[PDB]
Amino acid sequence: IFKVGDTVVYPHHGAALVEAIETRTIKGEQKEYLVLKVAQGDLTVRVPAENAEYVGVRDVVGQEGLDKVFQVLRAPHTEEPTNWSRRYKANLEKLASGDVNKVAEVVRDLWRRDQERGLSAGEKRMLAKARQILVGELALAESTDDAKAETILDEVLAA
DNA sequence: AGGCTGGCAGCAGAATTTAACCGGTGGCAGCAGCTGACCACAACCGATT
Numbered sequence: 001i002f003k004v005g006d007t008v009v010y011p012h013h014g015a016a017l018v019e020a021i022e023t024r025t026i027k028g029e030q031k032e033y034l035v036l037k038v039a040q041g042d043l044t045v046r047v048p049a050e051n052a053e054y055v056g057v058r059d060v061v062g063q064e065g066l067d068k069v070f071q072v073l074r075a076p077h078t079e080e081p082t083n084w085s086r087r088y089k090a091n092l093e094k095l096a097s098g099d100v101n102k103v104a105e106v107v108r109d110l111w112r113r114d115q116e117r118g119l120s121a122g123e124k125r126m127l128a129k130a131r132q133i134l135v136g137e138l139a140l141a142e143s144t145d146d147a148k149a150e151t152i153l154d155e156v157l158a159a
Numbered sequence: 160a161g162g163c164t165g166g167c168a169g170c171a172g173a174a175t176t177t178a179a180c181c182g183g184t185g186g187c188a189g190c191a192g193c194t195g196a197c198c199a200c201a202a203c204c205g206a207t208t
Contacts (some may be wrong), residue, residue: 082180088179
């Protein structure tokens with residue numbers, strides 16, 4: 001499926017350019033690896049081509065995905081558990097899934113709650129992580145000028 | 160049939176992994192609103208030599 005030069009999305013790290021395809025040997029068989037150059041912390045990720053779907057690597061979403069995530073990002077009736085730990089584990093396991101809709105849900109919930117009160121060290125760190133990978137995936141989805149994409153996200157969040 | 164005493168050997172002391180809400184209360188700290196006494200410059204007196 002994957003080709004050299006494709007821009008795929010890794011689950012917990014956001015965008016990833018597939019820059020080469022290695023052919024390393026483990027247990028005497030040439031399981032080909034693909035190397036991904038993510039840029040969040042400048043790490044090179046190597047995965048087999050077989051377990052790409054098992055680890056859940058995923059192509060970027062289309063314009064139906066864009067209107068779907070904007071539709072879910074502008075939606076009310078988002079009642080949350082009042083317990084701080086329950087809420088934290090809930091949106092952490094939403095963030096770790098790798099779905100654009102779930103990441104947009106986490107950034108809209110924490111954005112409205114930060115606009116309300118301003119939460120915490122851990123939740124501001126989580127909102128920064130989630131919003132930066134959502135901005136990176138959006139800029140990958142439309143080739144649309146990083147930090148101007150941030151202004152786009154701020155505008156569609158503030159509405 | 161057992162037992163309690165002799166060297167005997169070993170040991171101790173002394174010297175030179177992760178965080179966050181929520182309630183509620185006492186202390187702080189600053190500031191008009193009186194002060195209520197303090198301070199003072201100046202002027203006005205009470206006999207008295």
